[PDB]
Amino acid sequence: DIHTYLREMEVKCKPKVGYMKKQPDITNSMRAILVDWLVEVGEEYKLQNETLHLAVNYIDRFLSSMSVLRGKLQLVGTAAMLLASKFEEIYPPEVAEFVYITDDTYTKKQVLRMEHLVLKVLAFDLAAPTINQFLTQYFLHQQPANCKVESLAMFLGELSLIDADPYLKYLPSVIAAAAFHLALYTVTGQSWPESLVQKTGYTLETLKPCLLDLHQTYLRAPQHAQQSIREKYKNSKYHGVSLLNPPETLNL
What we know:
Oligomer: monomer
Entry title: bovine cyclin A3
Keywords: cyclin, cell cycle, kinase-regulatory-subunit, binding protein
Number of helices: 13
Strand content: under 5%
Number of strands: 0
Assembly: monomeric
Order of helices and strands: HHHHHHHHHHHHH
Helix content: 55-70%
Largest sheet: none
CATH class of the largest domain: Mainly Alpha
PDB class: binding protein
Name: cyclin A
Structural class: mainly alpha
């Protein structure tokens, strides 16, 4: 079954939690700006949210293996989005486009070389379990489907990609669970489903650490330096869920 596969693969695909400490030229802050920029790119080329999740995973696994100078951080990101679009998108944009987006900071030959470097560093393994993949499984336990709850779970899931500290500490399934509960609670007043507790083995107790973090992030979102996700979720496509008021307390 797909769920068990995803649970095994996510552990195999997870980046090193404290990789940023070993990076001599880049910081979490730089990473936050980069991810925010990819969200902009995805918006512009109308890329799937899945591609965005995959790209972030590639970049974190890459930076978990190879040191990078800030001058090439953006190329790592562009290469990762290229790799993700080719792997996920039906009509992924061509190198030319990804070169264009960098405002010609890099040449096509430069993107091509990084593409081959990241790919090699990733052991040529691109199928990694993302937050969206788990959410897709969770959404099945959502008795009558609720789009707004779905769009809020997605919004929260995306915010997590911005901050390596503390999100690198959690597996995608955990973040997806916290994101789903929170979205459910904010929109319906309902909590993490028993069917899900049984299927995943996660309870609100085990989900508490990530939920407290995700709760703060959600509350602090309008003040966060990066604002591309909030802006993205303001549209009707996403039921303007970014404009909802987060729950004051969670009554855990």
